mmCIF file of C-alpha atoms and ligand atoms in Angstrom:
data_model
loop_
_atom_site.group_PDB
_atom_site.id
_atom_site.type_symbol
_atom_site.label_atom_id
_atom_site.label_comp_id
_atom_site.label_asym_id
_atom_site.label_seq_id
_atom_site.Cartn_x
_atom_site.Cartn_y
_atom_site.Cartn_z
ATOM 1 C CA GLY N 1 4.640 -9.456 8.691
ATOM 2 C CA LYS N 2 1.580 -9.730 10.951
ATOM 3 C CA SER N 3 1.275 -11.803 14.047
ATOM 4 C CA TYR N 4 -2.288 -11.425 15.301
ATOM 5 C CA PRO N 5 -2.933 -11.636 19.022
ATOM 6 C CA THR N 6 -4.908 -14.431 20.601
ATOM 7 C CA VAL N 7 -8.342 -13.403 21.804
ATOM 8 C CA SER N 8 -10.751 -15.515 23.898
ATOM 9 C CA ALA N 9 -13.608 -17.556 22.428
ATOM 10 C CA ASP N 10 -16.101 -15.109 23.982
ATOM 11 C CA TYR N 11 -14.327 -12.234 22.200
ATOM 12 C CA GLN N 12 -14.561 -14.055 18.876
ATOM 13 C CA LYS N 13 -18.250 -14.783 19.438
ATOM 14 C CA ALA N 14 -18.887 -11.069 20.017
ATOM 15 C CA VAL N 15 -17.004 -10.194 16.825
ATOM 16 C CA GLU N 16 -19.260 -12.499 14.814
ATOM 17 C CA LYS N 17 -22.416 -11.206 16.551
ATOM 18 C CA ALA N 18 -21.375 -7.585 16.166
ATOM 19 C CA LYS N 19 -20.575 -8.127 12.495
ATOM 20 C CA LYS N 20 -24.139 -9.279 11.845
ATOM 21 C CA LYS N 21 -25.766 -6.486 13.835
ATOM 22 C CA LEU N 22 -23.526 -3.935 12.081
ATOM 23 C CA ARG N 23 -24.758 -5.195 8.706
ATOM 24 C CA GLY N 24 -28.395 -4.681 9.686
ATOM 25 C CA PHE N 25 -27.794 -1.304 11.348
ATOM 26 C CA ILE N 26 -25.590 0.166 8.614
ATOM 27 C CA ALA N 27 -27.918 -1.018 5.812
ATOM 28 C CA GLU N 28 -30.947 0.370 7.628
ATOM 29 C CA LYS N 29 -29.376 3.772 8.409
ATOM 30 C CA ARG N 30 -27.898 4.143 4.919
ATOM 31 C CA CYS N 31 -24.704 5.289 6.624
ATOM 32 C CA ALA N 32 -22.137 2.967 5.043
ATOM 33 C CA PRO N 33 -20.034 5.774 3.470
ATOM 34 C CA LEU N 34 -19.865 7.616 6.754
ATOM 35 C CA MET N 35 -18.866 4.465 8.639
ATOM 36 C CA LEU N 36 -16.103 3.762 6.037
ATOM 37 C CA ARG N 37 -14.859 7.306 6.539
ATOM 38 C CA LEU N 38 -14.872 6.808 10.323
ATOM 39 C CA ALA N 39 -12.783 3.633 9.989
ATOM 40 C CA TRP N 40 -10.373 5.233 7.513
ATOM 41 C CA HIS N 41 -9.950 8.441 9.552
ATOM 42 C CA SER N 42 -9.330 6.231 12.592
ATOM 43 C CA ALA N 43 -6.538 4.317 10.883
ATOM 44 C CA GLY N 44 -5.066 6.971 8.590
ATOM 45 C CA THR N 45 -3.300 8.784 11.419
ATOM 46 C CA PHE N 46 -0.636 6.129 11.808
ATOM 47 C CA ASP N 47 2.957 7.221 11.535
ATOM 48 C CA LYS N 48 5.324 4.314 11.007
ATOM 49 C CA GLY N 49 8.433 6.134 12.176
ATOM 50 C CA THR N 50 7.083 6.915 15.653
ATOM 51 C CA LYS N 51 4.471 4.137 15.801
ATOM 52 C CA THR N 52 1.855 6.656 16.892
ATOM 53 C CA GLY N 53 -1.772 7.077 15.848
ATOM 54 C CA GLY N 54 -3.574 4.372 13.930
ATOM 55 C CA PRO N 55 -6.757 2.357 14.507
ATOM 56 C CA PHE N 56 -6.732 2.242 18.327
ATOM 57 C CA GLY N 57 -10.084 3.724 19.201
ATOM 58 C CA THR N 58 -9.024 7.339 19.788
ATOM 59 C CA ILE N 59 -11.376 8.904 17.251
ATOM 60 C CA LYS N 60 -14.228 8.737 19.738
ATOM 61 C CA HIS N 61 -12.232 11.144 21.961
ATOM 62 C CA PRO N 62 -13.731 14.668 21.689
ATOM 63 C CA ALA N 63 -10.208 16.064 21.106
ATOM 64 C CA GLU N 64 -9.806 13.883 17.987
ATOM 65 C CA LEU N 65 -13.361 14.468 16.761
ATOM 66 C CA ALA N 66 -12.696 18.182 16.844
ATOM 67 C CA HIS N 67 -10.023 17.935 14.160
ATOM 68 C CA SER N 68 -11.433 19.736 11.131
ATOM 69 C CA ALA N 69 -10.578 16.709 8.955
ATOM 70 C CA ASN N 70 -13.063 14.833 11.122
ATOM 71 C CA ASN N 71 -16.010 17.234 10.707
ATOM 72 C CA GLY N 72 -19.194 15.172 10.685
ATOM 73 C CA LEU N 73 -17.654 12.050 12.244
ATOM 74 C CA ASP N 74 -19.158 12.749 15.680
ATOM 75 C CA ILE N 75 -22.468 11.765 13.983
ATOM 76 C CA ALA N 76 -20.894 8.401 13.180
ATOM 77 C CA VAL N 77 -19.557 7.839 16.687
ATOM 78 C CA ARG N 78 -22.965 8.701 18.164
ATOM 79 C CA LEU N 79 -24.839 6.440 15.756
ATOM 80 C CA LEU N 80 -22.713 3.471 16.798
ATOM 81 C CA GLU N 81 -22.705 3.928 20.539
ATOM 82 C CA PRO N 82 -25.960 2.060 21.306
ATOM 83 C CA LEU N 83 -24.797 -1.006 19.323
ATOM 84 C CA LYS N 84 -21.309 -0.804 20.781
ATOM 85 C CA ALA N 85 -22.813 -0.974 24.257
ATOM 86 C CA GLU N 86 -24.321 -4.355 23.373
ATOM 87 C CA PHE N 87 -20.737 -5.617 22.899
ATOM 88 C CA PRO N 88 -18.851 -4.365 25.926
ATOM 89 C CA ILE N 89 -16.136 -6.998 25.495
ATOM 90 C CA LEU N 90 -15.014 -5.521 22.168
ATOM 91 C CA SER N 91 -12.461 -2.697 21.968
ATOM 92 C CA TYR N 92 -13.729 0.475 20.276
ATOM 93 C CA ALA N 93 -10.653 0.051 18.115
ATOM 94 C CA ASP N 94 -11.880 -3.292 16.751
ATOM 95 C CA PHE N 95 -15.514 -2.146 16.646
ATOM 96 C CA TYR N 96 -14.823 0.833 14.356
ATOM 97 C CA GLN N 97 -12.587 -1.174 12.011
ATOM 98 C CA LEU N 98 -15.256 -3.887 11.894
ATOM 99 C CA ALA N 99 -17.861 -1.227 10.987
ATOM 100 C CA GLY N 100 -15.592 -0.182 8.108
ATOM 101 C CA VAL N 101 -15.274 -3.720 6.796
ATOM 102 C CA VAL N 102 -19.047 -4.160 7.069
ATOM 103 C CA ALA N 103 -19.735 -0.839 5.324
ATOM 104 C CA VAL N 104 -17.788 -2.084 2.235
ATOM 105 C CA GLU N 105 -19.500 -5.485 2.343
ATOM 106 C CA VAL N 106 -23.114 -4.332 2.650
ATOM 107 C CA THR N 107 -22.720 -1.912 -0.257
ATOM 108 C CA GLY N 108 -21.607 -4.856 -2.431
ATOM 109 C CA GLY N 109 -17.840 -4.591 -2.140
ATOM 110 C CA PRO N 110 -15.198 -7.176 -1.418
ATOM 111 C CA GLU N 111 -14.953 -9.129 1.789
ATOM 112 C CA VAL N 112 -12.028 -7.547 3.610
ATOM 113 C CA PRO N 113 -10.363 -9.982 6.052
ATOM 114 C CA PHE N 114 -10.769 -8.950 9.699
ATOM 115 C CA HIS N 115 -8.590 -9.972 12.628
ATOM 116 C CA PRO N 116 -9.527 -8.904 16.179
ATOM 117 C CA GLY N 117 -7.240 -7.763 18.974
ATOM 118 C CA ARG N 118 -6.659 -3.996 18.646
ATOM 119 C CA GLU N 119 -6.360 -2.316 22.036
ATOM 120 C CA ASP N 120 -7.933 1.031 22.856
ATOM 121 C CA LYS N 121 -5.080 3.494 23.481
ATOM 122 C CA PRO N 122 -5.186 6.554 25.715
ATOM 123 C CA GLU N 123 -3.773 9.334 23.545
ATOM 124 C CA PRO N 124 -5.037 10.497 20.201
ATOM 125 C CA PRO N 125 -2.407 11.495 17.649
ATOM 126 C CA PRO N 126 -1.692 15.113 16.836
ATOM 127 C CA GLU N 127 -3.919 16.772 14.253
ATOM 128 C CA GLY N 128 -2.900 17.260 10.624
ATOM 129 C CA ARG N 129 -1.925 13.764 9.443
ATOM 130 C CA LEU N 130 -4.888 13.004 7.215
ATOM 131 C CA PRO N 131 -4.624 14.006 3.530
ATOM 132 C CA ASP N 132 -5.494 17.458 2.219
ATOM 133 C CA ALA N 133 -8.014 17.283 -0.625
ATOM 134 C CA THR N 134 -6.523 20.291 -2.355
ATOM 135 C CA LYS N 135 -3.054 18.785 -2.736
ATOM 136 C CA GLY N 136 -1.538 16.301 -5.206
ATOM 137 C CA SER N 137 0.591 13.223 -5.738
ATOM 138 C CA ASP N 138 3.629 14.224 -3.681
ATOM 139 C CA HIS N 139 1.322 14.966 -0.780
ATOM 140 C CA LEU N 140 -0.467 11.662 -1.134
ATOM 141 C CA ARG N 141 2.832 9.794 -1.016
ATOM 142 C CA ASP N 142 3.999 11.744 2.027
ATOM 143 C CA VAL N 143 0.873 10.740 3.892
ATOM 144 C CA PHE N 144 0.105 7.205 2.654
ATOM 145 C CA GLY N 145 3.736 6.278 2.026
ATOM 146 C CA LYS N 146 6.134 8.090 4.354
ATOM 147 C CA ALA N 147 3.717 8.247 7.282
ATOM 148 C CA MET N 148 1.428 5.225 7.071
ATOM 149 C CA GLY N 149 3.798 2.962 5.055
ATOM 150 C CA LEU N 150 1.337 1.936 2.284
ATOM 151 C CA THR N 151 2.259 1.439 -1.379
ATOM 152 C CA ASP N 152 1.428 3.469 -4.492
ATOM 153 C CA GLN N 153 -1.005 0.701 -5.520
ATOM 154 C CA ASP N 154 -2.645 0.997 -2.088
ATOM 155 C CA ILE N 155 -3.140 4.760 -2.613
ATOM 156 C CA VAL N 156 -5.100 4.426 -5.856
ATOM 157 C CA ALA N 157 -7.156 1.456 -4.686
ATOM 158 C CA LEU N 158 -8.077 3.179 -1.391
ATOM 159 C CA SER N 159 -8.959 6.335 -3.260
ATOM 160 C CA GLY N 160 -11.692 4.166 -4.804
ATOM 161 C CA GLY N 161 -13.436 4.235 -1.392
ATOM 162 C CA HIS N 162 -14.986 7.437 -2.776
ATOM 163 C CA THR N 163 -17.052 5.155 -4.996
ATOM 164 C CA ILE N 164 -19.518 5.402 -2.117
ATOM 165 C CA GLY N 165 -20.671 8.518 -0.357
ATOM 166 C CA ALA N 166 -20.478 12.260 -0.893
ATOM 167 C CA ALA N 167 -18.873 15.432 0.381
ATOM 168 C CA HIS N 168 -20.934 18.017 2.321
ATOM 169 C CA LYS N 169 -20.310 21.759 2.229
ATOM 170 C CA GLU N 170 -20.931 21.980 5.967
ATOM 171 C CA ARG N 171 -18.329 19.294 6.667
ATOM 172 C CA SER N 172 -15.322 19.593 4.305
ATOM 173 C CA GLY N 173 -16.791 22.369 2.178
ATOM 174 C CA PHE N 174 -16.773 20.172 -0.933
ATOM 175 C CA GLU N 175 -20.271 18.972 -2.004
ATOM 176 C CA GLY N 176 -21.851 15.955 -3.701
ATOM 177 C CA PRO N 177 -21.203 12.350 -4.669
ATOM 178 C CA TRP N 178 -18.392 11.022 -6.826
ATOM 179 C CA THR N 179 -20.750 8.538 -8.519
ATOM 180 C CA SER N 180 -24.259 8.142 -9.822
ATOM 181 C CA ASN N 181 -24.709 5.178 -7.427
ATOM 182 C CA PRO N 182 -23.143 6.337 -4.129
ATOM 183 C CA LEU N 183 -24.464 3.490 -1.975
ATOM 184 C CA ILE N 184 -23.082 0.909 -4.415
ATOM 185 C CA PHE N 185 -19.467 -0.206 -4.034
ATOM 186 C CA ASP N 186 -18.191 -0.548 -7.607
ATOM 187 C CA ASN N 187 -15.402 0.751 -9.888
ATOM 188 C CA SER N 188 -17.518 3.771 -10.912
ATOM 189 C CA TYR N 189 -15.238 6.187 -9.111
ATOM 190 C CA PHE N 190 -12.498 5.396 -11.673
ATOM 191 C CA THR N 191 -14.754 5.378 -14.713
ATOM 192 C CA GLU N 192 -16.068 8.872 -13.784
ATOM 193 C CA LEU N 193 -12.541 10.084 -13.095
ATOM 194 C CA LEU N 194 -11.536 9.013 -16.619
ATOM 195 C CA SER N 195 -14.581 10.389 -18.438
ATOM 196 C CA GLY N 196 -14.368 14.026 -17.618
ATOM 197 C CA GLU N 197 -16.292 16.034 -15.104
ATOM 198 C CA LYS N 198 -20.041 15.342 -15.421
ATOM 199 C CA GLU N 199 -22.484 17.828 -13.945
ATOM 200 C CA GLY N 200 -23.603 16.804 -10.493
ATOM 201 C CA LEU N 201 -20.548 14.686 -9.739
ATOM 202 C CA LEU N 202 -17.550 15.608 -7.545
ATOM 203 C CA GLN N 203 -13.832 15.322 -8.176
ATOM 204 C CA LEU N 204 -11.357 16.584 -5.509
ATOM 205 C CA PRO N 205 -7.950 17.897 -6.592
ATOM 206 C CA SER N 206 -6.586 14.824 -4.743
ATOM 207 C CA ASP N 207 -8.694 12.556 -6.996
ATOM 208 C CA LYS N 208 -7.553 14.314 -10.150
ATOM 209 C CA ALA N 209 -3.902 13.955 -9.072
ATOM 210 C CA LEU N 210 -4.255 10.265 -9.800
ATOM 211 C CA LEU N 211 -4.828 10.962 -13.513
ATOM 212 C CA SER N 212 -1.560 12.779 -14.113
ATOM 213 C CA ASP N 213 0.912 10.802 -11.995
ATOM 214 C CA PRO N 214 2.840 8.251 -14.070
ATOM 215 C CA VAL N 215 2.461 5.412 -11.488
ATOM 216 C CA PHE N 216 -1.062 6.188 -10.397
ATOM 217 C CA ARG N 217 -2.571 6.590 -13.900
ATOM 218 C CA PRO N 218 -1.997 2.987 -15.096
ATOM 219 C CA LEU N 219 -3.760 1.798 -11.896
ATOM 220 C CA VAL N 220 -6.750 4.092 -12.536
ATOM 221 C CA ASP N 221 -6.996 2.580 -16.026
ATOM 222 C CA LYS N 222 -6.697 -0.955 -14.691
ATOM 223 C CA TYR N 223 -9.454 -0.430 -12.170
ATOM 224 C CA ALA N 224 -11.736 1.309 -14.668
ATOM 225 C CA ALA N 225 -11.416 -1.630 -17.010
ATOM 226 C CA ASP N 226 -11.454 -4.472 -14.485
ATOM 227 C CA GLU N 227 -13.668 -4.195 -11.429
ATOM 228 C CA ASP N 228 -12.484 -7.572 -10.147
ATOM 229 C CA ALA N 229 -8.907 -6.280 -10.131
ATOM 230 C CA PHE N 230 -10.077 -3.214 -8.267
ATOM 231 C CA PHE N 231 -11.853 -5.377 -5.673
ATOM 232 C CA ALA N 232 -8.782 -7.513 -5.136
ATOM 233 C CA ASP N 233 -6.434 -4.558 -4.711
ATOM 234 C CA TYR N 234 -9.013 -2.663 -2.621
ATOM 235 C CA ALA N 235 -9.410 -5.595 -0.214
ATOM 236 C CA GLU N 236 -5.645 -5.915 0.227
ATOM 237 C CA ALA N 237 -5.236 -2.177 0.852
ATOM 238 C CA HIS N 238 -8.146 -1.822 3.284
ATOM 239 C CA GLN N 239 -6.923 -4.759 5.338
ATOM 240 C CA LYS N 240 -3.439 -3.192 5.555
ATOM 241 C CA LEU N 241 -4.923 0.194 6.384
ATOM 242 C CA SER N 242 -7.143 -1.295 9.107
ATOM 243 C CA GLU N 243 -4.114 -3.025 10.613
ATOM 244 C CA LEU N 244 -1.572 -0.227 10.699
ATOM 245 C CA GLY N 245 0.477 -0.354 13.884
ATOM 246 C CA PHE N 246 -1.409 -3.489 14.848
ATOM 247 C CA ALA N 247 0.010 -7.010 15.146
ATOM 248 C CA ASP N 248 3.196 -5.242 13.952
ATOM 249 C CA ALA N 249 3.075 -1.817 12.187
HETATM 250 C C1 HEM S 1 -6.775 10.095 -0.927
HETATM 251 C C2 HEM S 1 -6.816 11.039 -0.048
HETATM 252 C C3 HEM S 1 -8.212 11.365 0.441
HETATM 253 C C4 HEM S 1 -8.671 12.578 0.566
HETATM 254 C C5 HEM S 1 -7.898 13.849 0.219
HETATM 255 C C6 HEM S 1 -10.029 12.545 1.004
HETATM 256 C C7 HEM S 1 -10.816 13.627 1.203
HETATM 257 C C8 HEM S 1 -12.173 13.527 1.444
HETATM 258 C C9 HEM S 1 -13.127 14.597 1.648
HETATM 259 C C10 HEM S 1 -12.704 16.078 1.582
HETATM 260 C C11 HEM S 1 -14.324 14.111 1.886
HETATM 261 C C12 HEM S 1 -15.647 14.855 2.133
HETATM 262 C C13 HEM S 1 -16.092 14.879 3.570
HETATM 263 C C14 HEM S 1 -17.453 15.572 3.608
HETATM 264 O O1 HEM S 1 -17.536 16.772 3.281
HETATM 265 O O2 HEM S 1 -18.374 14.920 4.018
HETATM 266 C C15 HEM S 1 -14.205 12.650 1.854
HETATM 267 C C16 HEM S 1 -15.243 11.823 2.052
HETATM 268 C C17 HEM S 1 -15.202 10.481 1.997
HETATM 269 N N1 HEM S 1 -14.112 9.717 2.017
HETATM 270 FE FE1 HEM S 1 -12.251 10.408 1.472
HETATM 271 N N2 HEM S 1 -10.304 11.232 1.133
HETATM 272 C C18 HEM S 1 -9.262 10.445 0.817
HETATM 273 C C19 HEM S 1 -9.195 9.100 0.933
HETATM 274 C C20 HEM S 1 -10.174 8.263 1.368
HETATM 275 C C21 HEM S 1 -9.978 6.835 1.669
HETATM 276 C C22 HEM S 1 -8.572 6.209 1.635
HETATM 277 C C23 HEM S 1 -11.159 6.321 1.967
HETATM 278 C C24 HEM S 1 -11.575 4.904 2.398
HETATM 279 C C25 HEM S 1 -11.167 3.845 1.781
HETATM 280 C C26 HEM S 1 -12.154 7.388 1.843
HETATM 281 C C27 HEM S 1 -13.497 7.315 2.037
HETATM 282 C C28 HEM S 1 -14.350 8.367 2.019
HETATM 283 C C29 HEM S 1 -15.749 8.225 2.032
HETATM 284 C C30 HEM S 1 -16.496 6.924 2.021
HETATM 285 C C31 HEM S 1 -16.337 9.593 2.021
HETATM 286 C C32 HEM S 1 -17.852 9.818 1.998
HETATM 287 C C33 HEM S 1 -18.383 10.056 3.389
HETATM 288 C C34 HEM S 1 -19.895 10.368 3.392
HETATM 289 O O3 HEM S 1 -20.543 10.063 2.449
HETATM 290 O O4 HEM S 1 -20.377 10.950 4.345
HETATM 291 N N3 HEM S 1 -11.514 8.476 1.459
HETATM 292 N N4 HEM S 1 -12.875 12.411 1.583
HETATM 293 K K1 K S 2 -20.571 3.792 -6.817
#
């Protein structure tokens, strides 16, 4: 149920221009995982019942960056500011979601559809809406389902975003990559999850919760066996995530 706003031709030209420059910049800086995290932490604050939070540019606000869940994302915001300044017509809201789509693409993942038109909103949401890594399946459904309004399939697919990147003990406190190829967007997150803990590789309690939940576990198996199926479900979930509260909820 999305009705995307009309934006001017000049706006659409800037989107296409910005998309290309974001590819070059993110590939050069090797920061795709961090940019995906910035996009996801921007959007993941949406609460469907109140229609507050969501991907509306507030994460660049120092009050939102200071949330402990966002440790390390001020680096991301800073990295992007010079490029953003070359595209003054774009909202920060659109710019950060576009960076997220590009981060998935340049690491070899699916092409997530992107629609412009998000407005930058004045007030960041309250802290505490993003998921706690030490909790489990009920928690995940509270946050992805009851707050953001996403499905159980969306939760497992989006968890696969950890196929790129790593944790840092000075940011979350957790440390290391989930995969042997953490700048490559593939289904490796799920195959590692299934195989046991391997030395050097990370699994959060929130990752392991997927293995024991009766709805989540069949999806983990699907994705581990069929990367195309993962890509399809990932692309659907990321688009929905990136559009929470936008063009209708
Ligand atoms: C399912 C609930 C989730 C939890 C509990 C969670 C938790 C975490 C934690 C604790 C970190 C480590 C931060 C650090 O120390 O640097 C992290 C990193 C990361 N997260 Fe998630 N996350 C979740 C979902 C997501 C989703 C939905 C996405 C995007 C689709 C995502 C993408 C990433 C990425 C790409 C990193 C790596 C960042 C980097 O390499 O610097 N995560 N997550
Ligand atoms: K990977």
